[model samples]
Target: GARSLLQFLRLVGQLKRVPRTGWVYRNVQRPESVSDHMYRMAVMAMVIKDDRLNKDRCVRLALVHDMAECIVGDIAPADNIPKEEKHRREEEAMKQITQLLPEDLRKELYELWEEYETQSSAEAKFVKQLAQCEMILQASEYEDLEHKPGRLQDFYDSTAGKFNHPEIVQLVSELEAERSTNIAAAAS
Candidate 1:
């Protein structure tokens, strides 16, 4: 058990070095890693307030939603891979990684990952929206910090009108407003 646990952790550590491919493709000066994205998504999930949702489950989902990427690397939509093939690869990786845990733990974690992948539950759906929201938020941050002003428009465009959760929609609008102000100021 100890050997399996340690090996599992070692695999997770690999995520720290796997840069999110979207940013890499966009030529970001220094892109964030997969772990970086997952970490912020977990934080985003924590800050959500909804009586209908299980916040803890949302956090757990956020963490494992991308855990498979640690092994498969960050595969972005632009990579030209088929959706089915991508899912297949990640599924295989999930199998290998979860096998490292004790049975119950492995089952639970794998189920959480599947819940996220399938969006079969409320928590899963919310975390999925939060995942997109987090990416846009990061894009906004990069826009402000790098002084690139609208250079990351593709990130924002990707999620336009796609977010349905009221709380997340509000947050996204706020982000957009701030982005507008920043861009306007830059133009002046």
Candidate 2:
């Protein structure tokens, strides 16, 4: 942990207003901040259970996956550099953020973040899918292409058929169906 808890606490507080970069770029109004997105994922982790995954780890991963954005800020898909570079920068950001936690939790933080980034372990794979599911659900709520353009499609393209979990695939499918229904209702 840091010499003073307050220093660490203050650093953690930066997520509130750091607008989700994708929404900011596309002029989407009042988009979820980084914390808002993490909070949603964490809550999803609470109830979305799987015997194949470490639910605690997934929930923890949900909480901290984007903790790095506190240091580097959020970046959208259109950042236009190699995606690997973004992952590198964010992995480093999360590594730095992990330093402020107590020794016991720091290791867990690092492991969870690494697992989430790498998508290697079972827990990691499930949480990774949930993360994208969260984004897909978030995208479903946003305005149409006329209102926000490629913002929705980018999320759709990124997550389409990419999940490894049945539950996650169901979520993506449900959101797609719901969105289709939404568009249909609006037109009718």
- Listing every candidate in turn, what is its Cα RMSD in Å to the true structure after a full C-alpha superposition? 0.9, 2.7
- The clash count of every prediction, one per candidate, is 0, 0
- Candidate 1 lDDT, tens digit per residue, 1-188? 89999999999999999999999998887899899999988898888777899899999998999999888988888889998999999999999999999999999999999998888999999999999999998898887788899989999998988999999999999989999998899889
Q: What root-mean-square deviation over C-alphas does model 1 reach?
A: 0.9
Tens-place lDDT digits, model 2, residues 158-187: 776687688777777877887877767766
- Between which residue pairs do clashes occur in model 1? none
On lDDT, the leading prediction is: 1
lDDT of 1 at 31: 92
